[PDB]
Amino acid sequence: NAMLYPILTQSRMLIDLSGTWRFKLDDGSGFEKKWYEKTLDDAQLMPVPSSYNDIKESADLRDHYGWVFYQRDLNIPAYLKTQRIVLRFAAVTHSAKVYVNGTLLCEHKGGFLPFETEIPENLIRDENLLTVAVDNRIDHSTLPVGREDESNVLGGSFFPYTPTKKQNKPNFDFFNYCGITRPVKLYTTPKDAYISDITLTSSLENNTARINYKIDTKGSAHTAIGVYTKQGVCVAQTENTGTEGSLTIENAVLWEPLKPYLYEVKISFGEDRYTLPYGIRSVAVKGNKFLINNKPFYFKGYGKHEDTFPAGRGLNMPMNAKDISLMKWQGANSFRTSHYPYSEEMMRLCDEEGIVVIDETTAVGVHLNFRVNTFDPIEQGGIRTQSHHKEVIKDLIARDKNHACVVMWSIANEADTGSKGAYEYFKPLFDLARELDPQKRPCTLVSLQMVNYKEDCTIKLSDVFCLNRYYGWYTCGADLQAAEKMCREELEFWNSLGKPFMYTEYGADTVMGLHDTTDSMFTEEYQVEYYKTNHKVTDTLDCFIGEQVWNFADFATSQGLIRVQGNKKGLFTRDRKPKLAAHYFKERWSKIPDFGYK
């Protein structure tokens, strides 16, 4: 469960295994024939990390159903066996079986969070094969959810037809990109005593900044901790200390949105050494305010995706940096990890750059009615995701708990939260997130637009109400006067509750290069008018504390009659070029402060 990010230290090797791997589609016999026991025969080559779906020009590969096998040689020095040897998979989408030579080492469910396994030293021969089988299938038990008998609401035909081949049935908009999404690395620690986890929280009372620490270890040794400024000056340290304690940081500089400050927290245990960057800041909800460092924050930003061409969902470090640069150019301060945890490289970069993050689980598609009710008992056909949903919350918080940039947990996106049984499904998950987060950050779920919005169970659970609303697109299309009236009528209800609420999605599909002076859907001008109309309302509501558009950039989806080669609601194109509305938001957000707007 504990998943410190692997780094190169005085006690820890870090060997990236990314590169060109062998790759073979399963044909139904890959496990029966034990393909993992030998070199893959008649295979292709595929880059790792990457989604596999768009690398070639093959629809059969893009739309593959089931398993694929990745493989590479693993020839390492025998002297590594004096250390503990760990194989870390930052993400394999969706499920994985990992073999070293003929031996199954581990299995994992969940396509967007890391997992690891020690390699038993007896298994390491002079020459080794590493094989990773990757399953892309989704159903009522996976997060994200795949449909079983439910029909395609975004990709329905006018006339029914029989598909040529069995395929996944996503219950979510974004394309089902699968493969070895994030890096695979070998790392080492000392065998006999090592650090397994580090937990840090901040206390800011009485004009004193302190870091509280909890160091989890294996074995028996002495612990030491020191806190260092950017320039390397030690500002607090203690040796031969307890597993838990606190350190006062004199002259403490707080981490602020768009003004980051990261200390370096250096820990030793026996011969083991680990350094964690850490920003000191407070988060609290009070009344209708979202307080960061006791100041009333206004979210400006986006729902994003991890989506670039041609790697799909795969880690793209140059584009992560481009994206943050574009956010700062635009005057944004924040985004949400729609609809799955993002790479650690992104999260660590957001800590370094001062970008605020709403950290969301993989729980999209928990909705069987967009007659069996979504949250009926499993034995009568209800959704089967709650058990895995708990595991995802535990794993997400364990991975991201120390990030200053994370200010809120989003428990799910667009679940059936207006139906009976939703509160019962979600109450244990909100309780779990609050129990497990050492910083006790706000929790929310992101609310689907619904006719009976007053029955949304978010009202009984969340610290901030996070709304996805499309007044002027999925309703009132090309009637922005009606959109404004409908928007005002519902958002005045949310404002009357006196709690913080915000948009986490709002937007209009826009094909770059389509134009009209006169309100016309899909044009760049309509996208601007759509947003102007919505802001006419939100700017008058004192409890509305944030605007995150759908979406930062155009991204790939499943095929159908309302998806013009993917989702076109980006302010930017897929290659990160600004539409008219991106210039509109640069002007608007330049005039809105991060603090004190409302």
**Active site amino acids:** 414, 505
> Within 10 Å of residue 574's Cβ, how many Cβ atoms?
19
Closest separation between CB of residue 563 and a copy of itself, Å? 21
Closest separation between CB of residue 521 and a copy of itself, Å? 16
- Binds 173, which of a copy of itself, Cl ion, none (CB < 5 to 8 A, cut-off by type)? Cl ion
Buried b (16+ CB within 10 A) or exposed e, 16-35: ebbeebbbbbbeeebeeeeb
Place of tokens 């990709």: 155
- Start-to-end CA span in the chain (Å): 40
Query: Segment contacting Cl ion (CB under 5 A): 64-72, 144-152, 166-174, 289-297?
Result: 166-174
Sheet holding 67-74, edge to edge: 44-48, 19-25, 67-74, 128-135, 95-100, 103-109
Closest separation between CB of residue 49 and Cl ion, Å? 21
Comparing CB distances to a copy of itself, the nearer of 106 and 580 is: 580
- Binds 471, which of a copy of itself, Cl ion, none (CB < 5 to 8 A, cut-off by type)? none
Closest separation between CB of residue 586 and a copy of itself, Å? 9
Comparing CB distances to a copy of itself, the nearer of 31 and 329 is: 329
- Binds 577, which of Cl ion, a copy of itself, none (CB < 5 to 8 A, cut-off by type)? a copy of itself
Closest separation between CB of residue 486 and a copy of itself, Å? 27
Residues of this chain, 3-32, that bind Cl ion according to CB under 5 A: none
Comparing CB distances to a copy of itself, the nearer of 289 and 586 is: 586
Comparing CB distances to a copy of itself, the nearer of 434 and 586 is: 586
- Binds 174, which of Cl ion, a copy of itself, none (CB < 5 to 8 A, cut-off by type)? Cl ion
Place of tokens 């581990």: 106
Q: Two tokens at 431?
A: 């309780």
> How far apart are the C-alpha atoms of 522 and 575, rounded to whole Å?
18
Place of tokens 């990773």: 132
- Binds 525, which of Cl ion, a copy of itself, none (CB < 5 to 8 A, cut-off by type)? a copy of itself
Sheet holding 210-218, edge to edge: 194-203, 210-218, 244-248
Comparing CB distances to a copy of itself, the nearer of 218 and 322 is: 322
Query: Segment contacting Cl ion (CB under 5 A): 21-29, 135-143, 169-177, 494-502?
Result: 169-177
3-state SS track over 432-479: HHHHHCCCCCCEEEEECCCCCHHHCCHHHHCCCEEEECCECCCECCCC
**DSSP state letter for 542:** T
Closest separation between CB of residue 593 and a copy of itself, Å? 23
Residue nearest to Cl ion (CB): 173
Comparing CB distances to Cl ion, the nearer of 26 and 173 is: 173
Query: Segment contacting Cl ion (CB under 5 A): 117-125, 165-173, 530-538, 575-583?
Result: 165-173
Decide if residue 375 touches Cl ion (CB under 5 A).
Answer: no
Decide if residue 400 touches Cl ion (CB under 5 A).
Answer: no
**DSSP state letter for 205:** G
Give the Cα-Cα-Cα angle 474, 476, 479 (nearest 5 degrees): 135
Query: Segment contacting Cl ion (CB under 5 A): 167-175, 183-191, 241-249, 307-315?
Result: 167-175
Q: Two tokens at 169?
A: 């049935």
At 538, give phi and psi (nearest 5°).
-65, -35
> How far apart are the C-alpha atoms of 543 and 494, rounded to whole Å?
8
Q: Which residues bind a copy of itself (CB under 8 A)?
A: 326, 329, 512-513, 515-517, 525, 577-578, 580, 583
Q: Two tokens at 502?
A: 């915000």
**Sign (positive or negative) of CA dihedral 343, 346, 348, 354:** negative
Give the Cα-Cα-Cα angle 349, 350, 353 (nearest 5 degrees): 85
Residues of this chain, 268-327, that bind Cl ion according to CB under 5 A: none
Comparing CB distances to a copy of itself, the nearer of 407 and 528 is: 528
Comparing CB distances to a copy of itself, the nearer of 312 and 566 is: 566
At 317, give phi and psi (nearest 5°).
-70, -40
Are residues 113 and 92 in contact, defined by beta-carbon separation less than 8 angstroms? no
Closest separation between CB of residue 394 and Cl ion, Å? 24
Comparing CB distances to a copy of itself, the nearer of 378 and 580 is: 580
Are residues 329 and 585 in contact, defined by beta-carbon separation less than 8 angstroms? no
Place of tokens 């109309």: 533
Closest separation between CB of residue 413 and Cl ion, Å? 8
Decide if residue 554 touches Cl ion (CB under 5 A).
Answer: no
Are residues 549 and 507 in contact, defined by beta-carbon separation less than 8 angstroms? yes
- Binds 580, which of Cl ion, a copy of itself, none (CB < 5 to 8 A, cut-off by type)? a copy of itself
Closest separation between CB of residue 505 and Cl ion, Å? 7
Element (H, E) at 545: strand 544-550
Are residues 119 and 100 in contact, defined by beta-carbon separation less than 8 angstroms? yes
- Binds 112, which of Cl ion, a copy of itself, none (CB < 5 to 8 A, cut-off by type)? none
- Binds 517, which of Cl ion, a copy of itself, none (CB < 5 to 8 A, cut-off by type)? a copy of itself
- Binds 329, which of a copy of itself, Cl ion, none (CB < 5 to 8 A, cut-off by type)? a copy of itself
Q: Which of 23, 112, 174, 263 binds Cl ion (CB under 5 A)?
A: 174
Name every residue whose Cβ is closer than 8 Å to that of residue 373 and which is 6 or more positions away in sequence: 382, 416, 419, 420, 421
Q: Which of 54, 135, 173, 351 binds Cl ion (CB under 5 A)?
A: 173
Beta-bridge partner residues of 547: 300, 503
Site string for Cl ion, 451-490 (x = CB under 5 A): ----------------------------------------
Q: Which residues make up the interface to Cl ion (CB under 5 A)?
A: 173-174
